[PDB]
Design a protein around this ligand. Sequence first.
Ligand SMILES: Nc1ncnc2c1ncn2[C@@H]1O[C@H](COS(=O)(=O)NC(=O)[C@@H]2CCCN2)[C@@H](O)[C@H]1O
Lengths: 439, 441
Amino acid sequence: GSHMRLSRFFLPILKENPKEAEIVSHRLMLRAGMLRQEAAGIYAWLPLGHRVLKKIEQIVREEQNRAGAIELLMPTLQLADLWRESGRYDAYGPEMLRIADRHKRELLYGPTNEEMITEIFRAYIKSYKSLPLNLYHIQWKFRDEQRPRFGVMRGREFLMKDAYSFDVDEAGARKSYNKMFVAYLRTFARMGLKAIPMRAETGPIGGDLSHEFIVLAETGESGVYIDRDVLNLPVPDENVDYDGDLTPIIKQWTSVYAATEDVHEPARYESEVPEANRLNTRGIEVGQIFYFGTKYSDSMKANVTGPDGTDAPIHGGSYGVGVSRLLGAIIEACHDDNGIIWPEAVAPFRVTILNLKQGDAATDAACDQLYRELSAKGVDVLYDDTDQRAGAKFATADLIGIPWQIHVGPRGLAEGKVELKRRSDGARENLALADVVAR
Amino acid sequence: GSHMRLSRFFLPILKENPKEAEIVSHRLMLRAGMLRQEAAGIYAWLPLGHRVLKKIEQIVREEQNRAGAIELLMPTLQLADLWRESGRYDAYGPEMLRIADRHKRELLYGPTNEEMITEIFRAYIKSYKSLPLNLYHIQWKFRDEQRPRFGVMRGREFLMKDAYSFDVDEAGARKSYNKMFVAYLRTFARMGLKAIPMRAETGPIGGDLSHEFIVLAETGESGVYIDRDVLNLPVPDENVDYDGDLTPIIKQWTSVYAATEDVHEPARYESEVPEANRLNTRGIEVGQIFYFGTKYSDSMKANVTGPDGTDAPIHGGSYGVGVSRLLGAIIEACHDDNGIIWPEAVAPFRVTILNLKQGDAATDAACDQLYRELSAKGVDVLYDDTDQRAGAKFATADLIGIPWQIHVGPRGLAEGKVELKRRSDGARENLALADVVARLT
Ligand SMILES: Nc1ncnc2c1ncn2[C@@H]1O[C@H](COS(=O)(=O)NC(=O)[C@@H]2CCCN2)[C@@H](O)[C@H]1O
């Protein structure tokens, strides 16, 4: 289990708030040594930030696999011609970064991957028997956003797990859509986020199949109207049967009202949601599921032979989690006046060890000992071993958001004890040096 | 320990050799449904392909960390203005993908990251007390290779681990370089490769101190000139002391003449080598290390305060490993007439269970249990539960090159036994359905 010492690390703390940051999470990612802007909307992820980014990446992956989706990797650069096949090339917009290689071939930095995935599908898959199929990757995208803004939350280069489903009819597709809906409730739950499924902007297709998963915040960009009972709903444990019928679970979440400003009916809101249960607020879109049937398979001629032996365009859906952007949501949703409060499951380190008289023989040895014992039992452990006063060490440990602190000085070591602090709520428990490892 | 059922999976095996694939590594990867060409030298990585690539990435990550380097991540898109600071803008020449954004801003797709990493460093580091510092990331890169070729070996969108050291003076840089040198020996060895550190030139990267780690091979774009002695030297174990004097190991590995063709000189060669060992020959370059002194720190004003209270530019070096290229190079060094033979460390799965009569409940259940137990016992396992017949399952499982096959069927199963094939060499073996798992764990 990974383990670092600050004096061997790279963690550039900024004492003061950077002018260029408006919302709290940007403001905090910069001070917490997690980020550097390289161009507008384009970020280097500094060591601490990358660790968090990796953890979010892993969780998202685990839930995709748990739901049966298969991981591959598509390239950043796509041919224009591919996009011409589907009629999105000129249609997508100026946010698509266009590139010309040395041979004047037209490529773009992919903002997304429907055409590409379809291309891949039609090259290999021929019979209804291979389906359902859910193919996904976690990969960098570009949208030449008009005003790159809010640090990681409206950037231009950004990390997204995008998933793509392939079914025989609308029936199978809605089944695949359920699978991802469930996978998503779990995903966000595992990140200490209550993200709410909300019916969101459908295309010319109509119907019900489109949901944005939204975390609530007054700082947020998307506006919402919700029946508060939805904040209390339970999130399927890890044993959910994904070959089964999730309609129950889906009904449990769609039954109660949930909508964004785009598809909101005042006349239906008033008809379903009791006066006191209503809440008009805003939120942060962290995930997005969208069923698009034969939109791509038509133009691209991605067909399979049905269970009656005739060729049909496949029905598909796509499912995106804003991986890089979660970093910004998680912090908005998890901070206080002292800085970040990482949920355990996404923190860059589980515990930091703080030396309150660094250089003194006895405490230095106790730190080493805990450093090494916590290391051996697969715990992510930073040991702040810098030549710096307790006060400085607290402000940083608190700033960077590590879930547990361990305070170690000659004081407590006198009666053979260390202070353990739980960041989220300030809980503290002066403890015996020999017990703390027992978590 | 990852587990998968080939019915659950996505693996598009090709029957014929692809006409486009000039060399084996390329041929095989397409055939073994690992890769797909999306553009000239730009590749999609299919599930199996991805999995290997992510194991390669991991072995490299581990060995970098063990050598004291610190992982971050820089973006794929860099500012041309940045490349103007150091000169390099007009000195990658045509292999640099230039991009204009919607606001007409000169961006490029980074082929490498010397200036950006320096940009970062100078922003935050001002004291010698902070060095040695080694920062690295594993990130996608683009070189507009004029004629993309040999699949993943000479493409355009490739994946590299590039790390960048920072020290007060040259002496420091040397220590830092030796660290990376030693980390490289382990990295490649851990992949079952014999990459030979040979002297090299630095080209656009810069510096007069450089080695390339080159894996010997016939179908390899690299002209090497090594004294064969060089070839069975000891690879330092997992417990090498990175803060201790690494000199002895570097010397061991550089006392013998070893040059790429760019630096090869023929006087020396003979008058330093046994004629019988002298072997001119081809190889693949899987990694390269350079010390470029104050190249970027000068032109970019990346200074630190030294011991004598004075300010002086830092001494840098960079270190790259062709992550995506390693797939290609591994196969070339590990194949036979029937397909890939994956070294254990980098295999997509450790063992595959081949079911030789799909639908018969007797073998099915016997397989399932074996599937489920090998999982729990922490091991990459693949179950071929397809509608396919033994012949086909043999050919496929041979192809994708899993180190171990498990042949389950009612012939051996009557005797409550199964066959175990080491893909490595074909060695076979019947043993009880029990004492099998324990022999892989
Ligand atoms: N087009 C390519 N396709 C696949 N792999 C490639 C490609 N170019 C470089 N490589 C791989 O990267 C390793 C190092 O490359 S290098 O020698 O040019 N070095 C550099 O670019 C320095 C070192 C890292 C960052 N800057 C090389 O050893 C090689 O394995």
